[PDB]
């Protein structure tokens, strides 16, 4: 027993990460096959990046302005593409250590794993929760752009997320691997404000169902609710709206625990109401919403 | 920017990580070069678990009794030996993944990668810290056991911690790579309890500055305060005392921020005296004290 934010293990994908160079601009990059994505900002000057034109910028670049290294070897760069926001590099040699993989563009509130990186080198592996404002909440320095978000499954690498930029809130803002932003951001150095970073109800519950099962119980109160009432209550506080589809994946926790999910909605709206009183649940002093319900059954349960 | 609870990446431990079956009783071994390191009590029935005499139960065992499984492959035990409460399988094959490493015996405070493994297959990685009662707050399931803690020092992996039980408390405990205990634990199924969970100051600190460097600044007061008047307060609120060692390894942070150590001292201990008021340093309601000095520098500067 015991709970924690646990990231994938990142080998799969430490295998993948390369350096990208463009003039005097370097940052990471992803080696899949005979590809290697990055942001397409690598083209761009510190002067370019207060109003870019990608088009117009990529019309001056050619495969050998591309340099792409992955250790310390030189991959030969036979073709260049702008995806969205990525640059796509074909390179005459296929990645050896190319993972079983797919790209998956997530939803608000879906957790995965961050392989921070700086010059193609792994630095270290954390997980993140897409915001509902389409935000991350990273730990990324200048250097650390290409880094990519990922799930895995068995032996199968999902990635979801490519790093671009930090907003001048601090928060961080990329793009799926087809180099479409989450949310309505822009890889262009103006001013960009996020919406409200509202609280991702449904992983709240699977924490506190996480928390049960780990013998944290004395939030558990005599009350129920309803989904009217509760989110009545959700809304007040920030957090998102709790539907149907929320209280289905709730279910399995629900079961082991003989907690009905609207009790533990009861016992999330007294939590809301009357705060911790200086309590703490798995070593939290505030509700954890960074886990989703697959996350909270994968560790309760050991997948590997 | 941007602060987060970050492992190593952990490729390089995967490449070490093998399945150990002795009689019906399976875990996790490290291979490294041609010995399989894994905890002793893989020797051990239910029955046993009681009140165990490794040495008359492993007198019953031969090298062929250790079924050693890497990936899907059988490795050949050649010997076997116990050294404190670990087994020492040889193998007539050096493992090619084997990465630069040490074994080191860590400090209470110190923060490591544990990469969580199930059957030999990695599940996943989270960072903890040695606390001052020589346990650790882990996610381990049955099954987990020989699962290990380590740093990395660009391309040296040191190893650091074994896992091999959970107290009636839910807390862990385990050895170093040459099979000692961490704390006065034994590997015997008899209910063992933990001392003071203190709270690591020196790590608290750190944190406080990594909160500054990101822009979290509400909590610094107009005070300082000494060594000896902070310590009397440190004791009060269950704080490892601050020693003159401690203050030299919050230099560079002092340094770079202009905060004294004594001054973020006297911050500290109004937050002990005062709480938070509902407030949050870098995401946390509570004080953090699994990032170190050294933790805090890796991250706030980029180290690969
Ligand atoms: O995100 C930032 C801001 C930033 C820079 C340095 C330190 C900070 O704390 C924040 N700058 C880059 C960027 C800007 C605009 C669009 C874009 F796609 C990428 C360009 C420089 O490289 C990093 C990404
Ligand atoms: O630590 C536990 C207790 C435990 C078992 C199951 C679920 C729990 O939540 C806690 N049992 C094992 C053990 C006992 C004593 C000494 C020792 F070295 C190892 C033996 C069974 O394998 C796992 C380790």
Request: aromatic share 10%; with cysteine; charged share 15%.
């Amino acid at each position: 027993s015991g709970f924690r934010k646990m990231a994938f293990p990142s080998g799969k994908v430490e295998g993948c990460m390369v350096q990208v160079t463009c003039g005097t601009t370097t940052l990471n990059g992803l080696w899949l096959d005979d590809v290697v994505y990055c942001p397409r900002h690598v083209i761009c000057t510190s002067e370019d990046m207060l109003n870019p034109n990608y088009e117009d910028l990529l019309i001056r670049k050619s495969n050998h302005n591309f340099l792409v290294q992955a250790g310390n070897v030189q991959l030969r760069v036979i073709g260049h593409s702008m995806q969205n926001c990525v640059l796509k590099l074909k390179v005459d040699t296929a990645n050896p250590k190319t993972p079983k993989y797919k790209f998956v563009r997530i939803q608000p509130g879906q957790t995965f794993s961050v392989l921070a990186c700086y010059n193609g080198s792994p630095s270290g592996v954390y997980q993140c929760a897409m915001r509902p404002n389409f935000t991350i909440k990273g730990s990324f320095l200048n250097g650390s752009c290409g880094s990519v978000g990922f799930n895995i499954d068995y032996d199968c690498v999902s990635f979801c997320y490519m790093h671009h930029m930090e907003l001048p809130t601090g928060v961080h803002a990329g793009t799926d691997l087809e180099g479409n932003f989450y949310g309505p951001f822009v890889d262009r150095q103006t001013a960009q404000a996020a919406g409200t970073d509202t609280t991702i109800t449904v992983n709240v519950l699977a924490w506190l169902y996480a928390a049960v099962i780990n013998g944290d119980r004395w939030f558990l109160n005599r009350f129920t609710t309803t989904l009217n009432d509760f989110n009545l209550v959700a809304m007040k506080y920030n957090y998102e709206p709790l539907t149907q589809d929320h209280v289905d994946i709730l279910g399995p926790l629900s079961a082991q625990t003989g907690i009905a999910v609207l009790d533990m909605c009861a016992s999330l709206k007294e939590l809301l109401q009357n705060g911790m009183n200086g309590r703490t649940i798995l070593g939290s002093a505030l509700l954890e919403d960074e886990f989703t319900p697959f996350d909270v059954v994968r560790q309760c349960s050991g997948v590997t």
